[PDB]
Amino acid sequence: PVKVCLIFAGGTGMNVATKLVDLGEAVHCFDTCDKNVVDVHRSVNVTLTKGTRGNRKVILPLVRPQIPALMDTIPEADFYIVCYSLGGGSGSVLGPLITGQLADRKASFVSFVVGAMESTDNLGNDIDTMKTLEAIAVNKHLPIVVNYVPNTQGRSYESINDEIAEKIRKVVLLVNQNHGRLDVHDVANWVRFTDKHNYLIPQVCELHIETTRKDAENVPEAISQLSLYLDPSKEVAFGTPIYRKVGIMKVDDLDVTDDQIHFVINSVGVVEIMKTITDSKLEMTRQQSKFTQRNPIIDADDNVDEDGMVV
Ligand SMILES: Nc1nc2c(ncn2[C@@H]2O[C@H](COP(=O)(O)OP(=O)(O)O)[C@@H](O)[C@H]2O)c(=O)[nH]1
Ligand SMILES: [Mg+2]
């Protein structure tokens, strides 16, 4: 198995991938067409589904039978990262289907998902995709751990994509197997926390990636925590998580970007994430339902022919 396999789906996933092409063979991209394929993608894996050239209900029956074929192109790995938009039609279908397959592999993985906010279609998709991940968490009895990134009004997709790529790199660093005290089994039991803590409920959880003790301590109701430290003198057993582990980073590790990084998993924040999306959609739909249009400028006295000609 490789150390980590990175999986990207849909346009948003393709776009984020462009920022990670230096990871090469470890990167696997999937989409239903080539609208988002650019030259830099030659450096990574790209697979497009057949017969599929925004509506998830339409895309699902077309792509479902192809999933096994997609999975054969994804090597066995010690950890996976999955990335896509919750709000489109392709990423939000391919992403969760592949995620289900990773759960069947008994894999350790996290996802980076985008809350798209343009339209009631985006918002409806966001809701259905979050519900999808919840259903998968239940059906596979496994936490589905996601770093949720909302497209906040006024912020460029470029900016958001940059932030996501930088977080993905921290996870790639986390799982690089080069840290003192930190095992592949330690990582597995961090993210698959229900395996050994059977009294906990598998569900959609959030991943919070923080670079200070203060920020990490402020994650509410933390369930499972992993901390990396460059200066082992700064290690402090803070917070109240159920599961906690620490790794010591190496100063000659060129990928070490920060002095300490905390990866905190909780789930209480998902309620507010859903509420924000549904309230936004309600407000947009209120406006749509309030919109009115004039009466017709034709009526029963008008002689209309088969082609719509009034002469
Ligand atoms: N953060 C981010 N959001 C995007 C990007 N492209 C599109 N979006 C938003 O995500 C929604 C889904 O787009 P996309 O991922 O291309 O759809 P898909 O190809 O059907 O999976 C769009 O309606 C936008 O609101 C991107 O590059 N970054
Ligand atoms: Mg697309």
Swiss-Prot record:
Alphabetically ordered keywords of this record: GTP-binding, Host cytoplasm, Hydrolase, Nucleotide-binding
EC category: hydrolase
Known EC number: 3.6.5.-
A single GO molecular function term of this UniProt record: GTP binding
Entries under InterPro entries matching the protein: PhuZ_C, Tubulin/FtsZ_GTPase_sf
Keyword Cytoplasm: no
Keyword Secreted assigned: no
Location relative to the cell: Host cytoplasm
Effect of D255A: No visible effect on filament formation, viral capsid movement capsid filling or phage DNA rotation
Domain comment (free text): Consists of two domains: a nucleotide-binding N-terminus that hydrolyzes GTP and a C-terminus domain necessary for polymerization. The domains are bridged by a long, central helix. Interactions between the C-terminus and the following monomer drive polymerization.
Function statement: A tubulin-like GTPase that forms filaments, which are required for positioning viral DNA and capsids in the middle of the host cell for optimal replication. The motor component of a partition system which pushes phage DNA (encased by protein gp105) to the center of the bacterial host cell. Also required for movement of phage capsids to the vicinity of the viral DNA and rotation of the encased viral DNA at midcell. Forms filaments during the lytic phase, which position phage DNA at the center of the bacterial host cell.
Listed name of the protein: Phage tubulin-like protein
Natural source organism: Pseudomonas phage 201phi2-1 (Pseudomonas chlororaphis phage 201phi2-1)
